[PDB]
């Protein structure tokens, strides 16, 4: 006999690229994600594939804010 | 609920203004009165304010809940803001339509000198 | 052209038009017209309202339309729940006035029902 399985897709290398406290340059990707598990905070942008990236030089900061206890990433100016 | 509906209506623009770090000119309208505040970018400090519940403004109006009162409040808030030296704000309609009394207030503030 | 809660034809003679009421036949229609003082051969289209209103109370003198239907239904229901011979005939849909059932009786029995196998 044979199997009807045997397929998969290539790994997409998502996840956090710069962790809390890391110094980054403007433009740096901070996290790659499907949809907004993390949300964009101060000095952070959200791209068309929901990548969060730095809009200014500084240090990465994660926090939980708002009425829904959501996770936000911001850049602290250094 | 009307109030919750209006708050939902206003949230997107308010979050955009906070992200932009703008100084807000927030308007609040009731059937009897209209109010205006100029709020610092942190969202928790009021720089200037003017409304029809103030005696100095309400004493010169036949009725505090119409377009003439709205224009008076807009002019007063713009004059006080210019006296404080602000000159640059973003209008926050707070979920009310940009129309009627709200629009008359905004037009009066623009005429008096606020840039928005 | 509105008597006893229904609409009567306007292009017909009064005597013919009145029979459209449930509970009014030719004889009762003739009696009602005689009581109202209206000719039988006059179309109700050319009748003034002052004649329709005098026809209406004459019609109301009788038991017609919904009242008559309720009365007939009540009498048949009384037979059925009494369970006499006539009531059983009404229950089973067979003729109730002693007609033959070996043949005929199609009005009471409906169309023919062929035997299955």
């Amino acid at each position: 006999g044979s199997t009807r399985n045997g397929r998969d897709s290539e790994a997409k290398r998502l996840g956090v690229k710069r962790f809390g406290g890391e110094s980054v340059l403007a433009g740096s990707i901070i996290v790659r994600q499907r949809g907004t598990k993390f949300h964009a905070g101060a000095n952070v942008g959200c791209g068309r594939d929901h990548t969060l990236f730095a809009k200014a030089d500084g240090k990465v900061k994660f926090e939980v804010k708002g009425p829904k206890n959501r996770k936000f990433i911001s850049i602290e100016a250094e | 609920d009307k109030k919750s509906a209006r708050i939902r209506r206003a949230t997107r623009a308010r979050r955009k203004l906070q992200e932009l770090g703008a100084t807000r000119l927030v308007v609040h309208r009731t059937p009897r009165h209209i109010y205006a505040q100029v709020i610092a970018p942190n969202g928790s400090e009021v720089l200037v304010a003017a409304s029809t519940v103030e005696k100095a403004i309400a004493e010169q109006l036949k009725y505090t809940g119409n377009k003439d009162a709205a224009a008076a409040v807009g002019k007063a808030v713009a004059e006080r803001a210019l006296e404080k030296g602000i000159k640059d704000v973003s209008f926050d309609r707070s979920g009310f339509q940009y129309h009627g009394r709200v629009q008359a207030l905004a037009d009066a503030a623009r005429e008096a000198g606020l840039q928005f | 052209a509105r008597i006893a809660g229904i609409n009567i034809p306007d292009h017909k003679h009064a005597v013919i038009a009145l029979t459209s009421i449930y509970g009014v036949g030719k004889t009762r229609s003739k009696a009602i017209l005689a009581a109202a003082g209206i000719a039988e051969d006059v179309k109700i289209s050319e009748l003034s309202e002052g004649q329709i209103d005098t026809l209406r109370d004459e019609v109301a003198k009788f038991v017609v339309e919904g009242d008559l239907r309720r009365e007939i239904s009540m009498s048949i229901k009384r037979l059925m729940d009494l369970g006499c011979y006539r009531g059983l005939r009404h229950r089973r849909g067979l003729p109730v006035r002693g007609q033959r059932t070996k043949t005929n009786a199609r009005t009471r029995k409906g169309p023919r029902k062929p035997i299955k196998k």
């Binding site: - | - | 809660g5 229904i6 609409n7 339309e65 919904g66």
Partner: protein, 177 residues
């Protein structure tokens, strides 16, 4: 307007004495009257919906709104978005005039009429009734009708229960049985 004045000038005090309300704002009010036609045969001939809408417009003195299917239903061969009804919402003066017309003219002209059911309340003081034939409304000419058509009438009331709803309706001499 006549029935509105009648309400404000007798019904308020009648209901206040009957139910011992502490405020006039507690008195049940007639919020709205909604007329509906479920024209499920328009899927075969949409012109039937047009005729039904014309009849509703004649009856209520208002332009009706065509209502579409909320979802596809296999049982009735309708897809989502199919226009299958028409409704009219009456408030204020139009509501009061229609209420007066319905109470004093149309309801007595109902075939074999013997009073409206007092159990046609939804539990929160709103009333619903069904008119089998539109010809009871004098605005509809019996000679020009191409097809008999019924409708549903709902009176939505600010009452809190069926007893208060029926008291308010009976204060207008509603023809209950």
């Amino acid at each position: 307007a006549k029935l509105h004045d009648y309400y404000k000038d007798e019904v308020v005090k009648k209901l206040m004495t009957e139910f011992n309300y502490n405020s006039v704002m507690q008195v049940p009010r007639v919020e709205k009257i909604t007329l509906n036609m479920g024209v499920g045969e328009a899927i075969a001939d949409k012109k039937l919906l047009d005729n039904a809408a014309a009849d509703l417009a004649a009856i209520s003195g208002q332009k009706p709104l065509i209502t579409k299917a909320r979802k596809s239903v296999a049982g009735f061969k309708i897809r989502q978005g199919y226009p299958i009804g028409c409704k009219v919402t009456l408030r204020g003066e139009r509501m009061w005039e229609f209420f007066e017309r319905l109470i004093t003219i149309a309801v007595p002209r109902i075939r074999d009429f013997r009073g409206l059911s007092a159990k046609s309340f939804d539990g929160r003081g709103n009333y619903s009734m069904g008119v089998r034939e539109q010809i009871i409304f004098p605005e509809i000419d019996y000679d020009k009708v191409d097809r008999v058509r019924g409708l549903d009438i709902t009176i939505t009331t600010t009452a809190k229960s069926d007893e208060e709803g029926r008291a308010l309706l009976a204060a207008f001499d509603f023809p209950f049985r």
